[PDB]
Amino acid sequence: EFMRIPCVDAGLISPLVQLLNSKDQEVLLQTGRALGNICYDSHSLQAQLINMGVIPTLVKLLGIHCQNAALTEMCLVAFGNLAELESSKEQFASTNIAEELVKLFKKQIEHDKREMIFEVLAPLAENDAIKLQLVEAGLVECLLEIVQQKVDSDKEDDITELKTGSDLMVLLLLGDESMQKLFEGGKGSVFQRVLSWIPSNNHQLQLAGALAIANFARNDANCIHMVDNGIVEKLMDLLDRHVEDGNVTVQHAALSALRNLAIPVINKAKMLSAGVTEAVLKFLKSEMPPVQFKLLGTLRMLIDAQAEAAEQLGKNVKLVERLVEWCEAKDHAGVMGESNRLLSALIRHSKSKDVIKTIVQSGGIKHLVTMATSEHVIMQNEALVALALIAALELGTAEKDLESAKLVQILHRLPEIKYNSMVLICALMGSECLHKEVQDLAFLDVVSKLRSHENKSVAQQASLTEQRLTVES
């Protein structure tokens, strides 16, 4: 009888899975290769892969035949293909794969075979439990030894292993549990080694070291510890060495660490006192957007409620002119947005007339005005509050640019907490150039708030805005 033959499916695969428990090594080699070569792209196929327990069965086989190079190699190949599925990694994370791979790795004295294991470790280590399991199984001390063994070596294979090893270490630091384990309250081997990597001449170790700090610096307690222990000084020294003709990769990582470190309130004053601003502004002339992005982010974290710092930066005319420049960089959204946010924050946290004037003289108003129409609500009322401060402090010097930028027209079209637009209008009300107000038909909208807006905040200010817009204009 004529048979319909479907695409590869459970019927083809089921038989092969049953063979995984054979004591014949040829059979195991045939079936294992076959199973690792099949593409589990269908959802029913991966379901079958998971439900028939192929992954745990292969990890088991790797345990039993880790002395057989043919079987071991086939498992590694199989694992490399299987590992690429997120659902598969989850399953790997309930097995002994981490320990089995480290034991195996420790046994190897051939670069090629090490590399085979690296290519299984890397995808698997995207899973956070696997990361933690690798740390517990001793992977990092292997990695650190490899780096130490290969620093200062020009052998192609030495630099490649140092690279792959140091990168894998960083990957381990992206998982929260693995990272914290390695941090070990600020005395962990990795943290302390990295203090020797950052001041070194090896760019890959500078890079890996700076990234290790960045990834350690992902909660308050770690950041506070590292700042109390002088990490900011080493990162500034690292940055200084890369001002002139630097590696952008290392500049970015270093600035990324500083940005993370500046997040805790307690850190901000300490970093400012250490002179971190001066180190970071040496990269204003960078044309590399990632560097720009992270230098901007760092400054913004550092001024977060630090008025003296916001004031010194807001009056730095080179900084401000550069910000206005980067607000016009249309292709690089991150730096555009960070630059806009920095302009706003400079005003909100300093509340200084001098920074406000520096910003108007430099062209900043139109950019703040445009930011108020941002799709992100946080950025809109950051724009508004900054606008309100400039109304209240330097309306005279600004109203020309505020006219040009058509702010009152924008305010009208404006939502929820963007009700702060009403507060801005009432402060703009005392403007010569910005006469209407009235002509804009704002009296039709102002009192019409009442409630709803249902919020007691969004309702109550309507009475104030209605009393003001009725008594005048």
UniProtKB/Swiss-Prot annotation:
Post-translational modification summary for this protein: Forms covalent cross-links mediated by transglutaminase TGM2, between a glutamine and the epsilon-amino group of a lysine residue, forming homopolymers and heteropolymers.
Presence of the UniProt keyword Cytoplasm in the record: yes
Coiled-coil stretches noted in the UniProt entry, renumbered to this chain: none
Any one GO biological process: protein localization to nucleus
Quaternary structure and interacting proteins, as annotated: Interacts with RABL3. Interacts with RHOT1.
Clinical disorder: Alfadhel syndrome: An autosomal recessive neurodevelopmental disorder characterized by global developmental delay and regression, intellectual disability, hypotonia, delayed motor development, stereotypy, behavioral abnormalities, and dysmorphic features.
Biological function: Acts as a GEF (guanine nucleotide exchange factor) for the Rho family of small GTP-binding proteins (G proteins) that stimulates the dissociation of GDP to enable subsequent binding of GTP. Additionally, appears to chaperone the processing and/or trafficking of small GTPases containing a C-terminal polybasic region independently of GEF activity. Targets include RAP1A/RAP1B, RHOA, RHOB, RHOC, RAC1 and KRAS. Regulates mitochondrial dynamics by controlling RHOT function to promote mitochondrial fission during high calcium conditions.
Protein name (Swiss-Prot/TrEMBL): Rap1 GTPase-GDP dissociation stimulator 1
Native species: Homo sapiens (Human)
Name of the gene encoding the protein in the UniProt record: RAP1GDS1
